[PDB]
Design an enzyme around this catalytic site. Structure first.
Site, PDB file in Angstrom:
ATOM      1  N   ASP A 243      18.560  41.179 -74.322  1.00 42.09           N
ATOM      2  CA  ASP A 243      19.529  41.143 -73.234  1.00 42.09           C
ATOM      3  C   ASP A 243      19.711  42.607 -72.803  1.00 42.09           C
ATOM      4  OD1 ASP A 243      21.644  40.774 -71.500  1.00 42.09           O
ATOM      5  OD2 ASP A 243      23.105  40.287 -73.062  1.00 42.09           O
TER       6      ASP A 243
ATOM      7  N   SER B 174      10.326  46.514 -55.285  1.00 42.64           N
ATOM      8  CA  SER B 174      10.349  45.536 -54.205  1.00 42.64           C
ATOM      9  C   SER B 174      10.325  46.291 -52.908  1.00 42.64           C
ATOM     10  CB  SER B 174      11.658  44.718 -54.280  1.00 42.64           C
ATOM     11  OG  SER B 174      11.941  44.015 -53.077  1.00 42.64           O
TER      12      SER B 174
ATOM     13  N   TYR C 296      21.285  43.628 -53.654  1.00 38.00           N
ATOM     14  CA  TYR C 296      19.946  43.569 -54.214  1.00 38.00           C
ATOM     15  C   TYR C 296      19.191  44.849 -53.801  1.00 38.00           C
ATOM     16  CZ  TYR C 296      15.097  42.191 -54.967  1.00 38.00           C
ATOM     17  OH  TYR C 296      13.783  42.105 -55.352  1.00 38.00           O
TER      18      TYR C 296
ATOM     19  N   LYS D  21      17.478  47.903 -55.976  1.00 37.64           N
ATOM     20  CA  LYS D  21      16.064  48.264 -55.923  1.00 37.64           C
ATOM     21  C   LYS D  21      15.883  49.702 -55.416  1.00 37.64           C
ATOM     22  CE  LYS D  21      14.475  44.761 -57.978  1.00 37.64           C
ATOM     23  NZ  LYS D  21      13.460  44.907 -59.090  1.00 37.64           N
TER      24      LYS D  21
END
Ligand SMILES: C[C@]12CC[C@@H]3c4ccc(O)cc4CC[C@H]3[C@@H]1CC[C@@H]2O
Ligand SMILES: C[C@]12CC[C@@H]3c4ccc(O)cc4CC[C@H]3[C@@H]1CC[C@@H]2O
Lengths: 282, 282
Positions: free
Chosen positions: A65, A142, A155, A159
Protein backbone atom coordinates in the site's frame (compact mmCIF):
# COMPACT_ATOMS: atom_id res chain seq x y z
CA UNK A 1 15.89 -15.14 -12.82
CA UNK A 2 18.54 -12.45 -12.74
CA UNK A 3 16.93 -8.97 -13.26
CA UNK A 4 14.75 -8.19 -10.24
CA UNK A 5 11.76 -6.02 -11.09
CA UNK A 6 9.32 -4.59 -8.57
CA UNK A 7 6.09 -3.09 -9.97
CA UNK A 8 3.39 -1.27 -8.08
CA UNK A 9 -0.33 -1.46 -8.90
CA UNK A 10 -0.52 -4.80 -10.67
CA UNK A 11 -4.16 -5.71 -10.04
CA UNK A 12 -5.21 -4.53 -13.50
CA UNK A 13 -4.25 -2.37 -16.41
CA UNK A 14 -0.74 -1.56 -17.39
CA UNK A 15 0.84 -2.92 -14.23
CA UNK A 16 -0.87 -6.28 -14.69
CA UNK A 17 0.17 -6.53 -18.35
CA UNK A 18 3.70 -5.41 -17.70
CA UNK A 19 4.18 -7.88 -14.84
CA UNK A 20 3.13 -10.87 -16.99
CA UNK A 21 4.97 -9.58 -20.03
CA UNK A 22 8.23 -9.52 -18.01
CA UNK A 23 7.63 -12.78 -16.12
CA UNK A 24 6.81 -14.63 -19.33
CA UNK A 25 9.68 -13.17 -21.36
CA UNK A 26 11.24 -15.98 -23.45
CA UNK A 27 14.70 -15.12 -22.04
CA UNK A 28 13.51 -15.97 -18.49
CA UNK A 29 15.80 -13.16 -17.33
CA UNK A 30 13.28 -11.37 -15.12
CA UNK A 31 12.09 -12.09 -11.62
CA UNK A 32 8.99 -9.95 -11.02
CA UNK A 33 7.53 -8.84 -7.70
CA UNK A 34 4.06 -7.70 -8.68
CA UNK A 35 2.62 -5.65 -5.87
CA UNK A 36 -1.00 -4.86 -5.16
CA UNK A 37 -2.78 -2.72 -2.59
CA UNK A 38 -5.18 -5.55 -1.70
CA UNK A 39 -4.19 -9.18 -2.24
CA UNK A 40 -7.83 -10.15 -2.77
CA UNK A 41 -7.57 -8.61 -6.25
CA UNK A 42 -4.68 -10.82 -7.37
CA UNK A 43 -6.82 -13.31 -9.27
CA UNK A 44 -6.66 -11.57 -12.64
CA UNK A 45 -2.89 -11.36 -12.44
CA UNK A 46 -2.62 -15.15 -11.79
CA UNK A 47 -5.09 -16.01 -14.51
CA UNK A 48 -3.01 -13.88 -16.96
CA UNK A 49 0.23 -15.45 -15.72
CA UNK A 50 -1.18 -18.92 -16.29
CA UNK A 51 -2.42 -17.96 -19.79
CA UNK A 52 1.11 -16.84 -20.72
CA UNK A 53 2.65 -19.82 -18.99
CA UNK A 54 4.95 -17.78 -16.72
CA UNK A 55 7.49 -20.21 -15.34
CA UNK A 56 7.10 -21.06 -11.63
CA UNK A 57 8.97 -18.56 -9.51
CA UNK A 58 9.18 -15.88 -12.23
CA UNK A 59 6.36 -13.96 -10.55
CA UNK A 60 5.52 -13.31 -6.91
CA UNK A 61 2.81 -11.10 -5.49
CA UNK A 62 3.33 -8.87 -2.45
CA UNK A 63 0.82 -6.62 -0.74
CA UNK A 64 2.09 -3.02 -0.89
CA UNK A 65 0.00 0.00 0.00
CA UNK A 66 1.91 3.06 -1.29
CA UNK A 67 -0.04 5.24 1.14
CA UNK A 68 1.88 3.56 3.98
CA UNK A 69 5.65 3.74 4.43
CA UNK A 70 5.54 0.72 6.77
CA UNK A 71 3.93 -1.29 3.99
CA UNK A 72 6.61 0.02 1.58
CA UNK A 73 9.35 -0.97 4.05
CA UNK A 74 7.83 -4.43 4.58
CA UNK A 75 7.57 -5.19 0.84
CA UNK A 76 11.21 -4.15 0.38
CA UNK A 77 12.18 -6.70 3.06
CA UNK A 78 10.32 -9.43 1.12
CA UNK A 79 12.66 -9.00 -1.90
CA UNK A 80 14.75 -12.08 -1.20
CA UNK A 81 17.46 -11.15 -3.73
CA UNK A 82 18.19 -8.16 -1.51
CA UNK A 83 18.19 -5.82 -4.49
CA UNK A 84 15.81 -4.31 -7.05
CA UNK A 85 17.24 -3.75 -10.50
CA UNK A 86 14.17 -2.15 -12.02
CA UNK A 87 11.55 -0.29 -9.99
CA UNK A 88 8.32 0.48 -11.82
CA UNK A 89 6.26 3.17 -10.13
CA UNK A 90 2.88 2.53 -11.69
CA UNK A 91 0.29 2.69 -8.90
CA UNK A 92 -2.14 5.45 -9.83
CA UNK A 93 -5.66 6.76 -9.26
CA UNK A 94 -7.85 8.86 -11.50
CA UNK A 95 -10.38 11.48 -10.53
CA UNK A 96 -12.86 12.96 -12.98
CA UNK A 97 -15.46 15.65 -12.42
CA UNK A 98 -16.02 19.37 -11.81
CA UNK A 99 -13.48 20.47 -9.21
CA UNK A 100 -16.15 21.75 -6.77
CA UNK A 101 -17.91 18.35 -6.89
CA UNK A 102 -14.85 16.40 -5.68
CA UNK A 103 -14.58 15.40 -2.07
CA UNK A 104 -11.57 16.76 -0.24
CA UNK A 105 -10.67 13.22 0.84
CA UNK A 106 -10.75 11.98 -2.76
CA UNK A 107 -8.52 14.88 -3.81
CA UNK A 108 -6.03 14.15 -0.99
CA UNK A 109 -6.08 10.42 -1.84
CA UNK A 110 -5.18 10.99 -5.47
CA UNK A 111 -2.20 13.07 -4.48
CA UNK A 112 -1.18 10.74 -1.68
CA UNK A 113 -1.24 7.67 -3.91
CA UNK A 114 0.02 9.20 -7.17
CA UNK A 115 2.58 11.60 -5.85
CA UNK A 116 3.47 10.89 -2.23
CA UNK A 117 3.30 7.14 -2.85
CA UNK A 118 5.87 7.48 -5.62
CA UNK A 119 8.04 9.58 -3.28
CA UNK A 120 7.75 6.82 -0.61
CA UNK A 121 8.91 4.21 -3.15
CA UNK A 122 11.86 6.32 -4.28
CA UNK A 123 12.91 7.08 -0.72
CA UNK A 124 12.85 3.37 0.08
CA UNK A 125 14.62 2.09 -3.03
CA UNK A 126 16.74 4.87 -4.45
CA UNK A 127 19.47 4.85 -1.75
CA UNK A 128 20.43 1.27 -2.57
CA UNK A 129 20.61 1.99 -6.26
CA UNK A 130 22.76 5.07 -5.67
CA UNK A 131 25.13 2.94 -3.53
CA UNK A 132 25.44 0.22 -6.19
CA UNK A 133 25.78 2.75 -8.98
CA UNK A 134 23.01 1.07 -10.97
CA UNK A 135 19.28 0.74 -11.22
CA UNK A 136 16.41 1.69 -13.48
CA UNK A 137 13.27 3.46 -12.37
CA UNK A 138 10.32 3.62 -14.75
CA UNK A 139 7.35 5.80 -13.85
CA UNK A 140 3.97 5.54 -15.54
CA UNK A 141 3.25 8.99 -16.91
CA UNK A 142 0.38 10.33 -18.94
CA UNK A 143 -0.18 12.88 -21.65
CA UNK A 144 -2.32 14.44 -18.82
CA UNK A 145 0.97 15.19 -17.06
CA UNK A 146 2.03 17.23 -20.11
CA UNK A 147 -1.10 19.27 -20.78
CA UNK A 148 -4.16 20.20 -18.75
CA UNK A 149 -7.49 18.46 -19.53
CA UNK A 150 -10.84 19.88 -18.40
CA UNK A 151 -12.51 17.96 -15.58
CA UNK A 152 -9.24 16.15 -14.85
CA UNK A 153 -7.81 18.98 -12.76
CA UNK A 154 -6.62 16.84 -9.85
CA UNK A 155 -5.54 13.90 -11.99
CA UNK A 156 -3.49 16.29 -14.21
CA UNK A 157 -2.18 18.01 -11.08
CA UNK A 158 -0.88 14.63 -9.90
CA UNK A 159 0.65 13.63 -13.28
CA UNK A 160 2.27 17.07 -13.74
CA UNK A 161 3.65 16.62 -10.20
CA UNK A 162 5.36 13.41 -11.31
CA UNK A 163 6.94 15.26 -14.23
CA UNK A 164 8.45 17.83 -11.87
CA UNK A 165 9.54 15.21 -9.37
CA UNK A 166 11.19 12.97 -11.94
CA UNK A 167 12.85 15.75 -13.91
CA UNK A 168 14.36 17.20 -10.72
CA UNK A 169 15.68 13.77 -9.74
CA UNK A 170 17.01 13.01 -13.21
CA UNK A 171 19.27 16.10 -13.17
CA UNK A 172 20.89 14.85 -9.95
CA UNK A 173 20.99 11.12 -10.89
CA UNK A 174 22.95 11.55 -14.12
CA UNK A 175 26.35 10.83 -12.47
CA UNK A 176 25.07 8.01 -10.22
CA UNK A 177 24.35 5.58 -13.03
CA UNK A 178 20.69 5.34 -11.87
CA UNK A 179 18.28 5.89 -14.75
CA UNK A 180 14.83 7.35 -14.37
CA UNK A 181 12.27 7.42 -17.19
CA UNK A 182 8.64 8.43 -17.50
CA UNK A 183 6.56 6.37 -19.93
CA UNK A 184 4.03 8.86 -21.27
CA UNK A 185 0.80 7.04 -22.03
CA UNK A 186 -2.18 8.23 -24.01
CA UNK A 187 -5.50 6.35 -23.57
CA UNK A 188 -5.04 2.60 -23.15
CA UNK A 189 -7.64 -0.13 -23.44
CA UNK A 190 -8.25 -1.27 -19.83
CA UNK A 191 -13.73 6.55 -12.20
CA UNK A 192 -16.87 8.83 -12.42
CA UNK A 193 -19.90 9.67 -10.26
CA UNK A 194 -23.71 9.52 -10.52
CA UNK A 195 -25.14 12.32 -12.76
CA UNK A 196 -27.47 13.09 -9.85
CA UNK A 197 -24.55 13.44 -7.42
CA UNK A 198 -22.55 15.61 -9.81
CA UNK A 199 -25.50 17.88 -10.60
CA UNK A 200 -26.15 18.24 -6.90
CA UNK A 201 -22.64 19.61 -6.39
CA UNK A 202 -22.20 21.90 -9.38
CA UNK A 203 -24.19 24.28 -11.57
CA UNK A 204 -26.26 23.29 -14.60
CA UNK A 205 -23.81 24.94 -17.06
CA UNK A 206 -20.76 23.09 -15.65
CA UNK A 207 -22.83 19.91 -15.67
CA UNK A 208 -23.65 20.50 -19.31
CA UNK A 209 -19.98 21.01 -20.18
CA UNK A 210 -19.19 17.80 -18.25
CA UNK A 211 -21.54 15.92 -20.55
CA UNK A 212 -19.84 17.41 -23.60
CA UNK A 213 -16.46 16.43 -22.23
CA UNK A 214 -17.61 12.84 -21.58
CA UNK A 215 -18.92 12.59 -25.10
CA UNK A 216 -15.64 13.92 -26.47
CA UNK A 217 -13.40 11.64 -24.39
CA UNK A 218 -15.46 8.62 -25.40
CA UNK A 219 -14.64 9.44 -29.01
CA UNK A 220 -10.94 10.04 -28.36
CA UNK A 221 -10.76 6.69 -26.60
CA UNK A 222 -12.46 4.87 -29.50
CA UNK A 223 -10.03 6.36 -32.00
CA UNK A 224 -6.85 6.52 -30.02
CA UNK A 225 -6.76 3.96 -27.24
CA UNK A 226 -3.80 1.63 -27.58
CA UNK A 227 -3.64 -2.06 -26.78
CA UNK A 228 -1.96 -2.67 -23.39
CA UNK A 229 0.54 -4.97 -25.19
CA UNK A 230 1.80 -2.10 -27.29
CA UNK A 231 2.11 0.15 -24.21
CA UNK A 232 3.80 -2.49 -22.05
CA UNK A 233 6.39 -2.98 -24.80
CA UNK A 234 7.39 0.68 -24.51
CA UNK A 235 8.39 -0.01 -20.89
CA UNK A 236 10.59 -2.83 -22.14
CA UNK A 237 12.16 -0.67 -24.80
CA UNK A 238 13.02 1.86 -22.06
CA UNK A 239 14.41 -0.77 -19.71
CA UNK A 240 16.68 -2.19 -22.39
CA UNK A 241 17.98 1.19 -23.69
CA UNK A 242 21.67 1.43 -22.78
CA UNK A 243 21.22 5.16 -22.19
CA UNK A 244 17.52 5.77 -21.48
CA UNK A 245 16.00 9.20 -22.09
CA UNK A 246 13.87 10.96 -19.46
CA UNK A 247 10.64 10.41 -21.42
CA UNK A 248 9.29 7.77 -23.76
CA UNK A 249 6.01 8.37 -25.56
CA UNK A 250 3.71 5.48 -26.30
CA UNK A 251 2.17 7.47 -29.12
CA UNK A 252 3.09 10.59 -31.12
CA UNK A 253 -0.54 11.55 -31.71
CA UNK A 254 -0.54 14.35 -29.11
CA UNK A 255 2.89 15.75 -29.89
CA UNK A 256 1.39 18.62 -31.98
CA UNK A 257 -0.90 19.82 -29.19
CA UNK A 258 2.11 19.50 -26.95
CA UNK A 259 4.15 21.64 -29.35
CA UNK A 260 1.47 24.32 -29.63
CA UNK A 261 1.39 24.29 -25.86
CA UNK A 262 5.19 24.62 -25.82
CA UNK A 263 5.32 27.38 -28.51
CA UNK A 264 3.00 29.78 -26.69
CA UNK A 265 4.28 30.03 -23.08
CA UNK A 266 1.47 32.42 -22.17
CA UNK A 267 -0.79 29.38 -22.59
CA UNK A 268 -3.57 31.18 -24.49
CA UNK A 269 -3.18 29.27 -27.78
CA UNK A 270 -3.37 25.99 -25.94
CA UNK A 271 -6.34 26.96 -23.77
CA UNK A 272 -8.27 28.21 -26.79
CA UNK A 273 -7.35 25.22 -29.00
CA UNK A 274 -8.24 22.73 -26.28
CA UNK A 275 -11.48 24.50 -25.49
CA UNK A 276 -12.65 24.39 -29.12
CA UNK A 277 -11.38 20.79 -29.41
CA UNK A 278 -13.48 19.53 -26.46
CA UNK A 279 -16.52 21.84 -26.45
CA UNK A 280 -16.58 24.09 -29.51
CA UNK A 281 -16.52 27.88 -29.96
CA UNK A 282 -16.82 30.32 -27.01
CA UNK B 1 -13.33 50.10 -1.49
CA UNK B 2 -14.98 48.35 -4.40
CA UNK B 3 -12.73 45.46 -5.68
CA UNK B 4 -12.57 42.78 -2.98
CA UNK B 5 -9.29 40.89 -2.96
CA UNK B 6 -8.52 37.89 -0.77
CA UNK B 7 -4.85 36.80 -0.59
CA UNK B 8 -3.44 33.78 1.15
CA UNK B 9 -0.04 33.67 2.87
CA UNK B 10 0.48 37.33 3.68
CA UNK B 11 2.86 37.04 6.64
CA UNK B 12 5.90 37.73 4.47
CA UNK B 13 7.22 37.70 0.96
CA UNK B 14 5.13 38.23 -2.09
CA UNK B 15 1.80 37.96 -0.31
CA UNK B 16 2.79 40.64 2.19
CA UNK B 17 4.01 43.00 -0.54
CA UNK B 18 1.04 42.40 -2.76
CA UNK B 19 -1.46 42.99 0.07
CA UNK B 20 0.05 46.40 0.95
CA UNK B 21 0.57 47.33 -2.68
CA UNK B 22 -3.18 46.81 -3.33
CA UNK B 23 -4.41 48.36 -0.07
CA UNK B 24 -2.26 51.45 -0.59
CA UNK B 25 -3.11 51.89 -4.27
CA UNK B 26 -3.69 55.62 -4.96
CA UNK B 27 -7.10 54.81 -6.52
CA UNK B 28 -8.34 53.38 -3.19
CA UNK B 29 -10.29 50.88 -5.29
CA UNK B 30 -9.21 47.74 -3.44
CA UNK B 31 -10.41 46.22 -0.21
CA UNK B 32 -7.87 43.55 0.79
CA UNK B 33 -8.40 40.58 3.08
CA UNK B 34 -4.85 39.51 3.84
CA UNK B 35 -4.92 36.04 5.31
CA UNK B 36 -2.29 34.32 7.40
CA UNK B 37 -1.95 30.84 8.86
CA UNK B 38 -1.07 32.23 12.30
CA UNK B 39 -2.25 35.69 13.35
CA UNK B 40 0.77 36.08 15.64
CA UNK B 41 2.86 36.74 12.51
CA UNK B 42 0.78 39.70 11.34
CA UNK B 43 3.10 42.36 12.73
CA UNK B 44 5.22 42.78 9.61
CA UNK B 45 2.15 43.21 7.48
CA UNK B 46 0.83 46.03 9.75
CA UNK B 47 4.20 47.72 9.95
CA UNK B 48 4.35 47.69 6.10
CA UNK B 49 0.76 48.93 5.85
CA UNK B 50 1.55 51.82 8.17
CA UNK B 51 4.72 52.67 6.20
CA UNK B 52 2.66 52.93 3.00
CA UNK B 53 -0.13 54.74 4.80
CA UNK B 54 -2.87 52.28 3.78
CA UNK B 55 -6.16 54.02 4.49
CA UNK B 56 -8.13 52.65 7.46
CA UNK B 57 -10.36 49.81 6.36
CA UNK B 58 -8.46 49.11 3.12
CA UNK B 59 -6.80 46.09 4.74
CA UNK B 60 -8.11 43.44 7.13
CA UNK B 61 -6.33 40.34 8.36
CA UNK B 62 -8.06 36.98 8.75
CA UNK B 63 -6.61 33.73 10.04
CA UNK B 64 -6.86 31.10 7.28
CA UNK B 65 -5.12 27.74 7.40
CA UNK B 66 -5.32 26.29 3.86
CA UNK B 67 -4.75 22.82 5.31
CA UNK B 68 -8.23 23.04 6.87
CA UNK B 69 -11.46 23.36 4.90
CA UNK B 70 -13.29 24.56 8.03
CA UNK B 71 -10.79 27.40 8.31
CA UNK B 72 -11.30 28.13 4.58
CA UNK B 73 -15.09 28.14 5.07
CA UNK B 74 -14.84 30.41 8.13
CA UNK B 75 -12.63 32.99 6.38
CA UNK B 76 -15.07 33.08 3.45
CA UNK B 77 -17.86 33.92 5.92
CA UNK B 78 -15.78 36.85 7.25
CA UNK B 79 -15.85 38.57 3.81
CA UNK B 80 -18.50 41.12 4.71
CA UNK B 81 -19.03 42.23 1.09
CA UNK B 82 -20.31 38.72 0.44
CA UNK B 83 -18.16 38.40 -2.67
CA UNK B 84 -14.51 38.09 -3.69
CA UNK B 85 -13.57 39.75 -6.95
CA UNK B 86 -9.94 38.67 -6.99
CA UNK B 87 -8.67 35.55 -5.24
CA UNK B 88 -4.89 35.29 -4.93
CA UNK B 89 -3.70 31.78 -4.15
CA UNK B 90 -0.24 32.50 -2.84
CA UNK B 91 0.26 30.38 0.29
CA UNK B 92 3.25 28.15 -0.38
CA UNK B 93 5.98 26.09 1.28
CA UNK B 94 9.40 25.16 0.02
CA UNK B 95 11.37 22.00 0.67
CA UNK B 96 15.03 21.63 -0.22
CA UNK B 97 17.29 18.63 0.17
CA UNK B 98 18.10 15.13 -1.14
CA UNK B 99 14.79 13.31 -1.58
CA UNK B 100 15.77 10.45 0.77
CA UNK B 101 16.60 12.97 3.54
CA UNK B 102 13.09 14.50 3.58
CA UNK B 103 10.62 13.44 6.20
CA UNK B 104 7.43 11.90 4.87
CA UNK B 105 5.42 14.41 6.93
CA UNK B 106 7.30 17.34 5.41
CA UNK B 107 6.68 15.95 1.93
CA UNK B 108 2.95 15.50 2.63
CA UNK B 109 2.76 19.01 4.15
CA UNK B 110 4.23 20.67 1.08
CA UNK B 111 1.69 19.00 -1.14
CA UNK B 112 -1.18 19.60 1.26
CA UNK B 113 -0.43 23.31 1.57
CA UNK B 114 0.72 24.05 -1.99
CA UNK B 115 -1.62 21.86 -3.93
CA UNK B 116 -4.54 20.66 -1.82
CA UNK B 117 -4.76 24.04 -0.09
CA UNK B 118 -5.16 25.74 -3.46
CA UNK B 119 -7.83 23.17 -4.38
CA UNK B 120 -9.66 23.95 -1.08
CA UNK B 121 -9.62 27.67 -1.91
CA UNK B 122 -10.93 27.11 -5.44
CA UNK B 123 -13.65 24.77 -4.25
CA UNK B 124 -14.77 27.38 -1.72
CA UNK B 125 -14.64 30.44 -3.97
CA UNK B 126 -14.99 29.32 -7.55
CA UNK B 127 -18.72 28.40 -7.44
CA UNK B 128 -19.70 31.97 -6.57
CA UNK B 129 -17.59 33.40 -9.35
CA UNK B 130 -19.05 30.96 -11.87
CA UNK B 131 -22.57 32.01 -10.76
CA UNK B 132 -21.81 35.73 -11.12
CA UNK B 133 -20.01 35.22 -14.40
CA UNK B 134 -16.98 37.15 -13.14
CA UNK B 135 -13.92 36.84 -10.98
CA UNK B 136 -10.16 36.72 -11.25
CA UNK B 137 -7.95 34.08 -9.71
CA UNK B 138 -4.21 34.66 -9.58
CA UNK B 139 -1.95 31.83 -8.49
CA UNK B 140 1.67 32.30 -7.47
CA UNK B 141 3.69 30.07 -9.75
CA UNK B 142 7.39 29.51 -10.09
CA UNK B 143 9.87 28.77 -12.82
CA UNK B 144 10.25 25.57 -10.68
CA UNK B 145 6.76 24.62 -11.87
CA UNK B 146 8.06 24.79 -15.46
CA UNK B 147 11.33 22.88 -15.18
CA UNK B 148 12.78 20.44 -12.67
CA UNK B 149 15.56 21.65 -10.31
CA UNK B 150 17.84 19.24 -8.46
CA UNK B 151 17.20 18.99 -4.72
CA UNK B 152 13.83 20.71 -5.17
CA UNK B 153 12.03 17.52 -6.22
CA UNK B 154 9.01 17.95 -3.95
CA UNK B 155 8.81 21.72 -4.32
CA UNK B 156 8.91 21.34 -8.15
CA UNK B 157 6.38 18.50 -7.88
CA UNK B 158 4.04 20.88 -6.08
CA UNK B 159 4.55 23.81 -8.51
CA UNK B 160 4.19 21.54 -11.58
CA UNK B 161 0.98 20.27 -9.94
CA UNK B 162 -0.36 23.83 -9.88
CA UNK B 163 0.40 24.18 -13.59
CA UNK B 164 -1.67 21.09 -14.37
CA UNK B 165 -4.46 22.11 -12.04
CA UNK B 166 -4.74 25.64 -13.37
CA UNK B 167 -4.40 24.73 -17.03
CA UNK B 168 -7.15 22.12 -16.70
CA UNK B 169 -9.43 24.65 -15.01
CA UNK B 170 -8.64 27.40 -17.51
CA UNK B 171 -9.88 25.27 -20.44
CA UNK B 172 -13.25 24.87 -18.70
CA UNK B 173 -13.51 28.46 -17.34
CA UNK B 174 -13.14 30.22 -20.69
CA UNK B 175 -16.92 30.56 -21.23
CA UNK B 176 -17.73 31.43 -17.59
CA UNK B 177 -16.01 34.80 -17.61
CA UNK B 178 -13.80 33.68 -14.67
CA UNK B 179 -10.12 34.31 -15.36
CA UNK B 180 -7.32 32.25 -13.94
CA UNK B 181 -3.64 33.23 -14.25
CA UNK B 182 -0.38 31.87 -12.91
CA UNK B 183 2.28 34.48 -12.11
CA UNK B 184 5.54 32.66 -12.83
CA UNK B 185 8.20 33.96 -10.47
CA UNK B 186 11.94 33.48 -10.63
CA UNK B 187 13.98 34.16 -7.44
CA UNK B 188 12.66 37.10 -5.43
CA UNK B 189 14.37 39.00 -2.65
CA UNK B 190 12.57 37.88 0.55
CA UNK B 191 14.06 26.31 4.20
CA UNK B 192 17.12 23.96 4.64
CA UNK B 193 18.46 21.53 7.26
CA UNK B 194 21.61 21.07 9.36
CA UNK B 195 24.58 19.70 7.29
CA UNK B 196 24.91 17.06 10.01
CA UNK B 197 21.26 16.02 9.64
CA UNK B 198 21.45 15.91 5.86
CA UNK B 199 24.68 13.90 5.84
CA UNK B 200 23.15 11.49 8.31
CA UNK B 201 20.32 10.76 5.88
CA UNK B 202 22.11 10.57 2.54
CA UNK B 203 25.41 9.42 1.05
CA UNK B 204 28.61 11.47 0.90
CA UNK B 205 28.37 11.90 -2.92
CA UNK B 206 24.79 13.24 -2.80
CA UNK B 207 25.85 15.47 0.08
CA UNK B 208 28.69 16.79 -2.02
CA UNK B 209 26.36 17.54 -4.93
CA UNK B 210 24.02 19.28 -2.47
CA UNK B 211 26.85 21.62 -1.53
CA UNK B 212 27.53 22.35 -5.19
CA UNK B 213 23.86 23.07 -5.76
CA UNK B 214 23.72 25.45 -2.76
CA UNK B 215 26.73 27.30 -4.06
CA UNK B 216 25.16 27.56 -7.50
CA UNK B 217 21.75 28.74 -6.27
CA UNK B 218 23.39 31.38 -4.08
CA UNK B 219 24.97 32.80 -7.23
CA UNK B 220 21.76 32.66 -9.27
CA UNK B 221 19.97 34.50 -6.49
CA UNK B 222 22.64 37.24 -6.33
CA UNK B 223 22.41 37.82 -10.07
CA UNK B 224 18.78 37.23 -10.75
CA UNK B 225 16.62 37.85 -7.71
CA UNK B 226 14.02 40.51 -8.36
CA UNK B 227 12.73 43.14 -5.97
CA UNK B 228 9.33 42.14 -4.50
CA UNK B 229 7.93 45.47 -5.82
CA UNK B 230 8.67 44.49 -9.38
CA UNK B 231 7.10 41.04 -8.87
CA UNK B 232 4.01 42.37 -7.08
CA UNK B 233 3.42 44.74 -9.99
CA UNK B 234 3.15 41.77 -12.35
CA UNK B 235 0.15 40.58 -10.32
CA UNK B 236 -1.42 43.99 -10.84
CA UNK B 237 -0.74 43.94 -14.55
CA UNK B 238 -2.52 40.55 -14.71
CA UNK B 239 -5.46 41.71 -12.63
CA UNK B 240 -6.01 44.76 -14.83
CA UNK B 241 -5.66 42.93 -18.19
CA UNK B 242 -9.07 42.94 -19.87
CA UNK B 243 -8.34 39.47 -21.26
CA UNK B 244 -5.68 37.89 -19.02
CA UNK B 245 -3.47 35.11 -20.38
CA UNK B 246 -2.94 31.85 -18.47
CA UNK B 247 0.65 32.73 -17.54
CA UNK B 248 2.56 35.90 -16.79
CA UNK B 249 6.32 35.75 -16.35
CA UNK B 250 8.03 38.09 -13.94
CA UNK B 251 11.25 37.68 -15.88
CA UNK B 252 12.25 36.36 -19.31
CA UNK B 253 15.67 35.21 -18.11
CA UNK B 254 14.72 31.50 -18.01
CA UNK B 255 12.70 31.43 -21.22
CA UNK B 256 15.63 29.91 -23.19
CA UNK B 257 16.09 26.98 -20.79
CA UNK B 258 12.34 26.62 -20.96
CA UNK B 259 12.50 26.54 -24.77
CA UNK B 260 15.30 23.98 -24.84
CA UNK B 261 13.21 21.96 -22.45
CA UNK B 262 10.22 22.39 -24.78
CA UNK B 263 12.18 21.60 -28.00
CA UNK B 264 13.44 18.21 -26.84
CA UNK B 265 10.40 16.30 -25.47
CA UNK B 266 12.57 13.31 -24.59
CA UNK B 267 14.04 15.61 -21.92
CA UNK B 268 17.69 14.62 -22.47
CA UNK B 269 18.90 18.04 -23.70
CA UNK B 270 17.37 19.70 -20.68
CA UNK B 271 18.68 17.18 -18.17
CA UNK B 272 22.18 17.40 -19.60
CA UNK B 273 22.15 21.23 -19.88
CA UNK B 274 20.83 21.64 -16.35
CA UNK B 275 23.30 19.14 -14.96
CA UNK B 276 26.29 20.96 -16.48
CA UNK B 277 24.75 24.31 -15.45
CA UNK B 278 24.50 23.36 -11.75
CA UNK B 279 27.36 20.89 -11.24
CA UNK B 280 29.59 20.66 -14.31
CA UNK B 281 30.52 17.81 -16.65
CA UNK B 282 29.53 14.16 -15.98
C1 LIG C 1 -5.36 11.36 -19.79
C2 LIG C 1 -5.60 10.20 -20.79
C3 LIG C 1 -4.79 10.36 -22.06
C4 LIG C 1 -5.29 11.55 -22.86
C5 LIG C 1 -6.78 11.51 -23.21
C6 LIG C 1 -7.24 12.72 -23.99
C7 LIG C 1 -6.34 13.39 -24.83
C8 LIG C 1 -6.73 14.50 -25.58
C9 LIG C 1 -8.03 14.95 -25.49
O1 LIG C 1 -8.43 16.02 -26.27
C10 LIG C 1 -8.95 14.31 -24.65
C11 LIG C 1 -8.57 13.18 -23.89
C12 LIG C 1 -9.62 12.42 -23.09
C13 LIG C 1 -9.09 11.19 -22.32
C14 LIG C 1 -7.62 11.31 -21.94
C15 LIG C 1 -7.09 10.04 -21.18
C16 LIG C 1 -7.74 9.53 -19.91
C17 LIG C 1 -6.67 8.56 -19.28
C18 LIG C 1 -5.36 8.86 -20.06
O2 LIG C 1 -4.19 8.76 -19.22
C1 LIG D 1 12.65 28.04 -7.88
C2 LIG D 1 13.19 29.48 -7.73
C3 LIG D 1 13.31 30.18 -9.07
C4 LIG D 1 14.39 29.54 -9.91
C5 LIG D 1 15.77 29.48 -9.26
C6 LIG D 1 16.82 28.82 -10.13
C7 LIG D 1 16.71 28.89 -11.53
C8 LIG D 1 17.65 28.31 -12.36
C9 LIG D 1 18.73 27.64 -11.80
O1 LIG D 1 19.69 27.11 -12.64
C10 LIG D 1 18.86 27.54 -10.41
C11 LIG D 1 17.91 28.13 -9.56
C12 LIG D 1 18.14 28.13 -8.05
C13 LIG D 1 17.04 28.83 -7.21
C14 LIG D 1 15.67 28.80 -7.89
C15 LIG D 1 14.58 29.53 -7.04
C16 LIG D 1 14.26 29.14 -5.60
C17 LIG D 1 12.87 29.81 -5.31
C18 LIG D 1 12.33 30.23 -6.70
O2 LIG D 1 10.90 30.08 -6.79
Amino acid sequence: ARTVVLITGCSSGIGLHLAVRLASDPSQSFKVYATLRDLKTQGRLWEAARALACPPGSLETLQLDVRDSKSVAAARERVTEGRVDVLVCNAGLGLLGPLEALGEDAVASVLDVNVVGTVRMLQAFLPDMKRRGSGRVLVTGSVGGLMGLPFNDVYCASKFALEGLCESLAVLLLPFGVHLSLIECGPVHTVLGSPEEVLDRTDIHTFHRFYQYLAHSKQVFREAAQNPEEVAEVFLTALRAPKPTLRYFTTERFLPLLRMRLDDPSGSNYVTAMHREVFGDV
